[PDB]
Amino acid sequence: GSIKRFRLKQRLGKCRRQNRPVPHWYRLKNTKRRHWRRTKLGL
Template sequence: MGAKLKDGIHDLEYQQNDLAKKEKNNTTNHIDAMLIRYLSTSFRTKQKLARAQKQNRPIPQWIRLRTGNTIRYNAKRRHWRKTRIGL
């Protein structure tokens, strides 16, 4: 292992503890940034995003059965990176 420090903790353990603390700080900073973004978004924008998220799904299988497989897929399906919503 590593050399012992004065307080009896190994070097490796000390480094791992230090890395864990840094990771925790980065995570909390990221969460804080997300909260700020979330709080600054208006309710109307959130409603539009929620509606777009609900609409962006494949068609149910029972619709394929009911229509005799004439409707096979959702023509209005949207990829989050390729097509923008336009907010």
């Protein structure tokens, strides 16, 4: 928990990077997101 594993830490950082919202410019040429309290990573 408080101490961590390198593989777990990397995947969690990935999941956080994926989470952040879509570029607005893409809509000028957002289906999935997680919220930490109500949705856990299931790992």
